Design a protein around this ligand. Structure first.
Ligand SMILES: Cc1cc2c(nc3c(=O)[nH]c(=O)nc-3n2C[C@H](O)[C@H](O)[C@H](O)COP(=O)(O)OP(=O)(O)OC[C@H]2O[C@@H](n3cnc4c(N)ncnc43)[C@H](O)[C@@H]2O)c(O)c1C
Ligand SMILES: NC(=O)c1ccc[n+]([C@@H]2O[C@H](COP(=O)([O-])OP(=O)(O)OC[C@H]3O[C@@H](n4cnc5c(N)ncnc54)[C@H](O)[C@@H]3O)[C@@H](O)[C@H]2O)c1
Length: 364
Protein backbone atom coordinates (compact mmCIF):
# COMPACT_ATOMS: atom_id res chain seq x y z
CA UNK A 1 0.00 0.00 0.00
CA UNK A 2 1.25 3.54 0.73
CA UNK A 3 4.97 3.78 1.53
CA UNK A 4 6.14 3.80 5.15
CA UNK A 5 9.54 2.13 5.57
CA UNK A 6 11.05 0.94 8.83
CA UNK A 7 14.83 0.64 9.20
CA UNK A 8 16.10 -1.46 12.10
CA UNK A 9 19.60 -0.22 12.91
CA UNK A 10 21.17 3.21 12.53
CA UNK A 11 24.64 2.09 11.60
CA UNK A 12 26.49 2.83 8.41
CA UNK A 13 23.80 1.03 6.43
CA UNK A 14 20.88 2.51 8.33
CA UNK A 15 21.92 6.17 8.17
CA UNK A 16 22.66 5.88 4.45
CA UNK A 17 19.19 4.45 3.88
CA UNK A 18 17.49 6.94 6.21
CA UNK A 19 19.11 10.02 4.68
CA UNK A 20 18.26 8.70 1.22
CA UNK A 21 14.58 8.17 2.09
CA UNK A 22 14.49 11.52 3.88
CA UNK A 23 15.86 13.24 0.77
CA UNK A 24 13.26 11.43 -1.35
CA UNK A 25 10.50 12.52 1.07
CA UNK A 26 9.58 8.85 1.52
CA UNK A 27 7.94 8.32 4.94
CA UNK A 28 10.10 6.17 7.19
CA UNK A 29 11.09 5.45 10.78
CA UNK A 30 14.70 4.72 11.77
CA UNK A 31 15.06 2.68 14.97
CA UNK A 32 18.23 2.23 17.00
CA UNK A 33 18.76 1.19 20.61
CA UNK A 34 21.30 4.04 20.95
CA UNK A 35 20.73 7.76 20.73
CA UNK A 36 23.59 8.36 18.34
CA UNK A 37 25.43 6.76 15.43
CA UNK A 38 28.94 5.45 16.14
CA UNK A 39 31.65 6.00 13.52
CA UNK A 40 33.39 2.93 14.89
CA UNK A 41 35.91 3.01 12.01
CA UNK A 42 37.73 5.73 13.98
CA UNK A 43 37.24 4.24 17.46
CA UNK A 44 40.87 3.03 17.54
CA UNK A 45 42.16 6.55 16.95
CA UNK A 46 39.60 7.65 19.56
CA UNK A 47 41.45 5.29 21.91
CA UNK A 48 44.86 6.99 21.47
CA UNK A 49 44.18 10.69 20.73
CA UNK A 50 42.84 13.01 23.42
CA UNK A 51 39.69 14.90 22.53
CA UNK A 52 39.00 12.80 19.43
CA UNK A 53 36.04 10.75 20.72
CA UNK A 54 33.59 13.65 20.37
CA UNK A 55 34.10 13.37 16.59
CA UNK A 56 32.81 9.76 16.45
CA UNK A 57 29.25 10.01 17.83
CA UNK A 58 26.42 11.75 15.94
CA UNK A 59 22.97 12.28 17.42
CA UNK A 60 20.11 10.73 15.46
CA UNK A 61 17.62 13.31 16.85
CA UNK A 62 19.37 16.29 15.30
CA UNK A 63 19.34 14.72 11.83
CA UNK A 64 16.07 12.79 11.70
CA UNK A 65 13.75 14.38 14.30
CA UNK A 66 10.40 12.62 14.17
CA UNK A 67 11.65 9.98 11.73
CA UNK A 68 13.81 8.55 14.54
CA UNK A 69 12.77 6.36 17.47
CA UNK A 70 15.24 5.19 20.10
CA UNK A 71 14.33 1.69 21.10
CA UNK A 72 15.30 -1.95 21.33
CA UNK A 73 13.69 -4.02 18.58
CA UNK A 74 12.68 -7.33 20.15
CA UNK A 75 11.02 -8.96 17.15
CA UNK A 76 9.35 -8.70 13.75
CA UNK A 77 5.64 -9.50 13.54
CA UNK A 78 5.41 -10.67 9.93
CA UNK A 79 1.72 -11.56 10.03
CA UNK A 80 0.84 -7.94 10.89
CA UNK A 81 3.96 -6.40 9.20
CA UNK A 82 5.19 -4.48 12.26
CA UNK A 83 8.49 -4.00 14.08
CA UNK A 84 8.19 -4.73 17.82
CA UNK A 85 9.98 -2.59 20.42
CA UNK A 86 10.68 -3.47 24.04
CA UNK A 87 7.99 -1.82 26.15
CA UNK A 88 5.17 -2.64 23.73
CA UNK A 89 5.39 -0.12 20.87
CA UNK A 90 4.82 -1.49 17.38
CA UNK A 91 5.78 0.21 14.11
CA UNK A 92 3.88 -0.82 10.95
CA UNK A 93 5.94 -1.05 7.78
CA UNK A 94 5.20 -1.22 4.09
CA UNK A 95 8.85 -2.22 3.68
CA UNK A 96 11.51 -3.30 6.15
CA UNK A 97 15.27 -2.70 5.96
CA UNK A 98 17.26 -4.85 8.38
CA UNK A 99 20.61 -3.13 9.10
CA UNK A 100 21.56 -4.56 12.50
CA UNK A 101 25.33 -4.68 12.17
CA UNK A 102 27.28 -6.74 14.67
CA UNK A 103 28.49 -6.81 18.25
CA UNK A 104 32.05 -6.71 19.48
CA UNK A 105 34.26 -5.54 22.32
CA UNK A 106 35.21 -2.01 23.11
CA UNK A 107 37.10 -0.08 21.70
CA UNK A 108 36.37 -1.45 18.21
CA UNK A 109 32.61 -1.45 18.83
CA UNK A 110 30.38 0.50 21.22
CA UNK A 111 27.12 -1.46 21.42
CA UNK A 112 26.21 -0.10 24.89
CA UNK A 113 23.18 2.10 25.44
CA UNK A 114 24.55 5.14 27.25
CA UNK A 115 24.52 8.93 27.16
CA UNK A 116 26.59 10.59 24.46
CA UNK A 117 28.66 12.09 27.28
CA UNK A 118 29.37 8.72 28.91
CA UNK A 119 30.22 7.22 25.50
CA UNK A 120 32.72 9.97 24.68
CA UNK A 121 34.12 9.71 28.21
CA UNK A 122 34.64 5.95 27.95
CA UNK A 123 37.09 6.61 25.12
CA UNK A 124 38.75 9.56 26.88
CA UNK A 125 39.16 7.17 29.82
CA UNK A 126 40.74 4.74 27.34
CA UNK A 127 43.25 7.33 26.09
CA UNK A 128 44.48 7.85 29.66
CA UNK A 129 44.85 4.10 30.25
CA UNK A 130 47.08 3.86 27.17
CA UNK A 131 49.10 6.93 28.12
CA UNK A 132 49.72 5.39 31.56
CA UNK A 133 50.86 2.04 30.19
CA UNK A 134 54.45 1.39 29.16
CA UNK A 135 53.72 -2.17 28.01
CA UNK A 136 50.52 -2.92 26.04
CA UNK A 137 49.13 -6.12 24.51
CA UNK A 138 46.66 -6.23 21.61
CA UNK A 139 44.85 -9.59 21.28
CA UNK A 140 43.86 -10.50 17.73
CA UNK A 141 45.88 -9.57 14.66
CA UNK A 142 43.02 -9.24 12.18
CA UNK A 143 42.34 -6.01 10.37
CA UNK A 144 41.17 -4.32 13.57
CA UNK A 145 44.10 -5.42 15.71
CA UNK A 146 46.84 -4.36 13.32
CA UNK A 147 45.38 -0.86 13.26
CA UNK A 148 45.15 -0.83 17.05
CA UNK A 149 48.77 -1.87 17.48
CA UNK A 150 49.85 0.57 14.77
CA UNK A 151 47.86 3.47 16.23
CA UNK A 152 49.46 3.05 19.65
CA UNK A 153 53.03 2.87 18.33
CA UNK A 154 52.49 5.92 16.09
CA UNK A 155 51.11 8.19 18.84
CA UNK A 156 53.49 6.85 21.51
CA UNK A 157 56.60 5.55 19.74
CA UNK A 158 58.29 4.90 23.10
CA UNK A 159 55.75 2.35 24.29
CA UNK A 160 56.23 -1.41 24.18
CA UNK A 161 53.37 -2.91 22.13
CA UNK A 162 52.92 -6.63 21.58
CA UNK A 163 50.37 -7.95 19.07
CA UNK A 164 49.37 -11.58 19.67
CA UNK A 165 47.61 -13.35 16.82
CA UNK A 166 46.52 -16.96 16.42
CA UNK A 167 47.07 -17.02 12.63
CA UNK A 168 50.32 -17.14 10.67
CA UNK A 169 49.41 -14.04 8.63
CA UNK A 170 47.96 -10.69 9.71
CA UNK A 171 44.63 -9.14 8.72
CA UNK A 172 41.90 -10.43 6.41
CA UNK A 173 42.70 -13.68 4.65
CA UNK A 174 41.04 -12.37 1.48
CA UNK A 175 43.69 -9.66 1.14
CA UNK A 176 46.43 -9.79 -1.46
CA UNK A 177 49.55 -11.49 -0.02
CA UNK A 178 51.56 -8.37 -0.87
CA UNK A 179 49.16 -6.25 1.21
CA UNK A 180 49.35 -8.56 4.22
CA UNK A 181 53.17 -8.60 4.04
CA UNK A 182 53.39 -4.79 4.04
CA UNK A 183 51.04 -4.67 7.04
CA UNK A 184 53.54 -6.86 8.87
CA UNK A 185 56.53 -4.90 7.59
CA UNK A 186 55.04 -1.58 8.71
CA UNK A 187 54.33 -2.96 12.18
CA UNK A 188 57.91 -4.19 12.57
CA UNK A 189 59.33 -0.92 11.22
CA UNK A 190 57.21 0.85 13.86
CA UNK A 191 58.71 -1.54 16.42
CA UNK A 192 55.58 -3.47 17.34
CA UNK A 193 56.45 -6.96 18.55
CA UNK A 194 54.62 -9.78 16.75
CA UNK A 195 53.57 -13.07 18.38
CA UNK A 196 52.08 -15.02 15.48
CA UNK A 197 50.41 -18.43 15.71
CA UNK A 198 49.63 -17.78 19.40
CA UNK A 199 46.21 -17.87 21.05
CA UNK A 200 45.80 -15.91 24.28
CA UNK A 201 44.41 -18.56 26.61
CA UNK A 202 43.48 -16.87 29.93
CA UNK A 203 41.21 -14.12 28.60
CA UNK A 204 38.72 -14.57 31.43
CA UNK A 205 41.27 -13.50 34.04
CA UNK A 206 42.55 -10.46 32.12
CA UNK A 207 41.29 -6.96 32.92
CA UNK A 208 40.61 -5.13 29.65
CA UNK A 209 41.06 -1.47 28.73
CA UNK A 210 42.47 -0.78 32.20
CA UNK A 211 46.00 0.17 33.17
CA UNK A 212 47.52 -2.10 35.79
CA UNK A 213 50.89 -2.57 37.45
CA UNK A 214 51.10 -6.20 36.31
CA UNK A 215 48.97 -8.27 33.92
CA UNK A 216 50.06 -11.82 33.10
CA UNK A 217 48.95 -12.85 29.60
CA UNK A 218 49.26 -16.55 28.75
CA UNK A 219 48.99 -18.37 25.41
CA UNK A 220 48.13 -21.88 24.26
CA UNK A 221 51.84 -22.53 23.61
CA UNK A 222 52.72 -21.45 27.16
CA UNK A 223 54.17 -18.06 26.28
CA UNK A 224 53.75 -15.47 29.03
CA UNK A 225 53.79 -11.72 28.36
CA UNK A 226 53.72 -9.23 31.20
CA UNK A 227 51.86 -6.03 30.37
CA UNK A 228 50.16 -2.92 31.73
CA UNK A 229 47.18 -2.92 29.37
CA UNK A 230 45.20 -5.49 27.37
CA UNK A 231 43.02 -4.57 24.38
CA UNK A 232 40.70 -7.09 22.71
CA UNK A 233 40.52 -7.07 18.89
CA UNK A 234 39.38 -10.67 18.54
CA UNK A 235 36.42 -10.14 16.18
CA UNK A 236 32.73 -9.36 15.88
CA UNK A 237 29.45 -11.28 15.65
CA UNK A 238 26.36 -10.55 13.56
CA UNK A 239 23.66 -9.04 15.79
CA UNK A 240 20.50 -10.99 14.96
CA UNK A 241 18.48 -10.13 18.11
CA UNK A 242 15.88 -8.12 16.17
CA UNK A 243 14.95 -10.76 13.58
CA UNK A 244 16.34 -14.21 14.45
CA UNK A 245 12.96 -15.61 15.61
CA UNK A 246 10.72 -14.35 12.80
CA UNK A 247 13.39 -15.14 10.17
CA UNK A 248 14.86 -18.32 11.71
CA UNK A 249 14.47 -20.34 8.50
CA UNK A 250 16.34 -17.73 6.41
CA UNK A 251 19.52 -17.37 8.46
CA UNK A 252 23.00 -18.47 7.48
CA UNK A 253 25.01 -20.08 10.25
CA UNK A 254 26.57 -16.67 10.97
CA UNK A 255 23.12 -15.28 11.81
CA UNK A 256 23.16 -13.26 8.60
CA UNK A 257 20.01 -13.18 6.49
CA UNK A 258 20.15 -14.94 3.12
CA UNK A 259 19.48 -12.47 0.29
CA UNK A 260 19.20 -12.45 -3.48
CA UNK A 261 21.04 -10.20 -5.95
CA UNK A 262 18.56 -7.42 -5.06
CA UNK A 263 19.26 -7.71 -1.28
CA UNK A 264 15.72 -8.95 -0.71
CA UNK A 265 15.65 -11.38 2.20
CA UNK A 266 14.90 -14.93 1.06
CA UNK A 267 11.14 -15.50 1.00
CA UNK A 268 10.20 -11.82 1.03
CA UNK A 269 9.66 -9.10 -1.55
CA UNK A 270 9.40 -6.20 0.92
CA UNK A 271 12.20 -7.10 3.36
CA UNK A 272 15.83 -6.14 2.69
CA UNK A 273 19.09 -6.83 4.54
CA UNK A 274 22.08 -4.46 4.33
CA UNK A 275 25.44 -4.13 6.03
CA UNK A 276 26.95 -6.83 8.18
CA UNK A 277 23.61 -8.57 8.75
CA UNK A 278 23.18 -9.47 5.06
CA UNK A 279 24.55 -12.87 3.95
CA UNK A 280 26.98 -11.58 1.33
CA UNK A 281 30.28 -13.28 0.63
CA UNK A 282 32.60 -10.43 1.63
CA UNK A 283 34.41 -8.99 4.66
CA UNK A 284 32.19 -6.93 6.92
CA UNK A 285 32.60 -3.30 5.85
CA UNK A 286 31.02 0.07 6.53
CA UNK A 287 31.93 0.89 2.93
CA UNK A 288 29.75 -1.94 1.60
CA UNK A 289 26.93 -1.20 4.05
CA UNK A 290 26.52 2.17 2.35
CA UNK A 291 26.47 0.55 -1.08
CA UNK A 292 23.83 -1.92 0.13
CA UNK A 293 21.70 0.97 1.37
CA UNK A 294 21.60 2.57 -2.10
CA UNK A 295 20.37 -0.70 -3.58
CA UNK A 296 17.75 -1.42 -0.92
CA UNK A 297 16.29 2.10 -1.14
CA UNK A 298 16.46 2.03 -4.94
CA UNK A 299 14.61 -1.30 -5.02
CA UNK A 300 11.86 -0.34 -2.59
CA UNK A 301 11.13 2.54 -4.96
CA UNK A 302 11.57 0.36 -8.04
CA UNK A 303 9.13 -2.19 -6.66
CA UNK A 304 6.36 0.34 -5.98
CA UNK A 305 6.95 1.79 -9.47
CA UNK A 306 6.55 -1.85 -10.62
CA UNK A 307 9.99 -1.62 -12.37
CA UNK A 308 12.66 -4.35 -12.41
CA UNK A 309 15.02 -4.32 -9.43
CA UNK A 310 18.67 -3.35 -9.43
CA UNK A 311 21.28 -5.98 -8.70
CA UNK A 312 24.30 -5.56 -6.49
CA UNK A 313 27.31 -6.02 -8.76
CA UNK A 314 30.11 -7.27 -6.46
CA UNK A 315 33.61 -6.77 -7.82
CA UNK A 316 37.16 -7.44 -6.66
CA UNK A 317 37.90 -6.56 -3.04
CA UNK A 318 38.62 -2.96 -2.01
CA UNK A 319 40.11 -2.69 1.48
CA UNK A 320 42.36 -0.06 3.11
CA UNK A 321 44.41 -0.64 6.29
CA UNK A 322 45.32 2.52 8.18
CA UNK A 323 48.63 2.04 10.02
CA UNK A 324 48.69 4.96 12.41
CA UNK A 325 47.87 8.42 11.05
CA UNK A 326 51.10 8.49 8.97
CA UNK A 327 51.10 5.14 7.17
CA UNK A 328 49.05 2.29 5.74
CA UNK A 329 48.48 -0.03 2.81
CA UNK A 330 45.58 -1.64 0.99
CA UNK A 331 43.98 -2.57 -2.31
CA UNK A 332 41.45 -1.19 -4.75
CA UNK A 333 39.49 -3.62 -6.90
CA UNK A 334 42.12 -6.26 -6.20
CA UNK A 335 45.21 -4.10 -6.85
CA UNK A 336 47.82 -2.99 -4.31
CA UNK A 337 47.98 0.65 -3.18
CA UNK A 338 50.65 2.15 -0.96
CA UNK A 339 51.39 4.63 1.79
CA UNK A 340 50.67 7.96 0.12
CA UNK A 341 47.21 6.91 -1.09
CA UNK A 342 46.07 5.10 2.05
CA UNK A 343 47.49 7.74 4.36
CA UNK A 344 45.67 10.55 2.53
CA UNK A 345 42.48 8.60 1.84
CA UNK A 346 41.98 6.78 5.16
CA UNK A 347 44.69 7.37 7.78
CA UNK A 348 44.38 11.14 8.11
CA UNK A 349 40.63 11.50 8.82
CA UNK A 350 39.44 7.83 8.99
CA UNK A 351 36.39 8.79 6.86
CA UNK A 352 34.96 10.80 9.78
CA UNK A 353 33.85 13.66 7.51
CA UNK A 354 31.68 11.29 5.47
CA UNK A 355 29.43 10.45 8.43
CA UNK A 356 28.90 14.08 9.43
CA UNK A 357 28.13 14.73 5.75
CA UNK A 358 25.49 12.00 5.65
CA UNK A 359 24.00 13.18 8.97
CA UNK A 360 24.03 16.85 7.80
CA UNK A 361 25.76 17.95 11.00
CA UNK A 362 29.14 19.54 11.77
CA UNK A 363 31.51 17.78 14.18
CA UNK A 364 32.14 19.54 17.46
C1 LIG B 1 35.69 -3.42 14.37
C2 LIG B 1 36.12 -2.58 13.20
C3 LIG B 1 35.39 -2.62 12.04
C4 LIG B 1 35.76 -1.85 10.92
C5 LIG B 1 36.90 -1.03 11.00
N1 LIG B 1 37.32 -0.27 9.95
C6 LIG B 1 36.61 -0.31 8.85
C7 LIG B 1 37.01 0.48 7.76
O1 LIG B 1 38.01 1.19 7.79
N2 LIG B 1 36.24 0.44 6.62
C8 LIG B 1 35.10 -0.34 6.53
O2 LIG B 1 34.45 -0.31 5.47
N3 LIG B 1 34.71 -1.12 7.55
C9 LIG B 1 35.42 -1.10 8.66
N4 LIG B 1 35.04 -1.88 9.72
C10 LIG B 1 33.82 -2.70 9.59
C11 LIG B 1 32.60 -1.92 9.98
O3 LIG B 1 32.72 -1.45 11.32
C12 LIG B 1 31.30 -2.69 9.77
O4 LIG B 1 31.31 -3.29 8.46
C13 LIG B 1 30.17 -1.66 9.85
O5 LIG B 1 29.97 -1.13 11.16
C14 LIG B 1 28.86 -2.26 9.38
O6 LIG B 1 27.78 -1.28 9.43
P1 LIG B 1 26.26 -1.78 9.60
O7 LIG B 1 25.36 -0.67 9.18
O8 LIG B 1 26.14 -3.13 8.97
O9 LIG B 1 26.20 -1.96 11.18
P2 LIG B 1 26.61 -1.01 12.39
O10 LIG B 1 27.26 -1.88 13.42
O11 LIG B 1 27.38 0.14 11.82
O12 LIG B 1 25.20 -0.47 12.95
C15 LIG B 1 24.28 -1.42 13.53
C16 LIG B 1 23.31 -0.70 14.43
O13 LIG B 1 22.14 -1.53 14.63
C17 LIG B 1 21.59 -1.23 15.90
N5 LIG B 1 20.82 -2.39 16.33
C18 LIG B 1 21.16 -3.71 16.19
N6 LIG B 1 20.26 -4.54 16.66
C19 LIG B 1 19.27 -3.71 17.16
C20 LIG B 1 18.05 -3.96 17.80
N7 LIG B 1 17.58 -5.18 18.04
N8 LIG B 1 17.30 -2.90 18.17
C21 LIG B 1 17.78 -1.67 17.93
N9 LIG B 1 18.90 -1.30 17.33
C22 LIG B 1 19.61 -2.38 16.97
C23 LIG B 1 22.78 -1.02 16.81
O14 LIG B 1 22.65 -0.26 17.99
C24 LIG B 1 23.80 -0.38 15.86
O15 LIG B 1 23.80 1.05 15.95
C25 LIG B 1 37.64 -1.00 12.21
O16 LIG B 1 38.73 -0.20 12.30
C26 LIG B 1 37.25 -1.75 13.30
C27 LIG B 1 38.04 -1.71 14.58
N1 LIG C 1 39.99 -1.83 6.90
C1 LIG C 1 38.76 -2.29 7.04
O1 LIG C 1 37.91 -2.19 6.15
C2 LIG C 1 38.43 -3.01 8.32
C3 LIG C 1 39.09 -2.76 9.52
C4 LIG C 1 38.79 -3.50 10.64
C5 LIG C 1 37.80 -4.44 10.57
N2 LIG C 1 37.17 -4.72 9.40
C6 LIG C 1 36.23 -5.87 9.28
O2 LIG C 1 35.54 -5.99 10.51
C7 LIG C 1 35.37 -7.39 10.80
C8 LIG C 1 36.04 -7.67 12.13
O3 LIG C 1 37.49 -7.51 11.98
P1 LIG C 1 38.42 -7.80 13.26
O4 LIG C 1 39.87 -7.70 12.91
O5 LIG C 1 37.92 -7.01 14.42
O6 LIG C 1 38.09 -9.34 13.54
P2 LIG C 1 38.53 -10.65 12.74
O7 LIG C 1 37.68 -11.80 13.17
O8 LIG C 1 38.57 -10.28 11.29
O9 LIG C 1 40.03 -10.88 13.26
C9 LIG C 1 40.27 -11.21 14.66
C10 LIG C 1 41.31 -12.30 14.74
O10 LIG C 1 41.66 -12.55 16.12
C11 LIG C 1 42.09 -13.88 16.22
N3 LIG C 1 41.91 -14.31 17.60
C12 LIG C 1 40.73 -14.64 18.22
N4 LIG C 1 40.87 -14.97 19.48
C13 LIG C 1 42.23 -14.85 19.70
C14 LIG C 1 43.03 -15.07 20.84
N5 LIG C 1 42.54 -15.44 22.02
N6 LIG C 1 44.37 -14.85 20.72
C15 LIG C 1 44.85 -14.46 19.53
N7 LIG C 1 44.20 -14.23 18.40
C16 LIG C 1 42.88 -14.45 18.55
C17 LIG C 1 41.17 -14.67 15.30
O11 LIG C 1 41.63 -15.90 14.77
C18 LIG C 1 40.90 -13.67 14.18
O12 LIG C 1 41.71 -13.91 13.03
C19 LIG C 1 35.96 -8.16 9.61
O13 LIG C 1 34.97 -8.47 8.63
C20 LIG C 1 36.95 -7.18 8.99
O14 LIG C 1 37.15 -7.27 7.59
C21 LIG C 1 37.43 -3.96 8.30
Amino acid sequence: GALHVVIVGGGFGGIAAASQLQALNVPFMLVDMKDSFHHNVAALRASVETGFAKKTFISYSVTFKDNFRQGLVVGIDLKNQMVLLQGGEALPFSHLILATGSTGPFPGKFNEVSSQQAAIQAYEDMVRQVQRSRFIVVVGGGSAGVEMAAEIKTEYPEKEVTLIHSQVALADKELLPSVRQEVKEILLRKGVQLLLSERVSNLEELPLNEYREYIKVQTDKGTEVATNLVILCTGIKINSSAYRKAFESRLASSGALRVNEHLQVEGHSNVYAIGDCADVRTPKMAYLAGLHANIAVANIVNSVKQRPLQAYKPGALTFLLSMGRNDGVGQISGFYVGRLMVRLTKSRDLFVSTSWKTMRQSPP
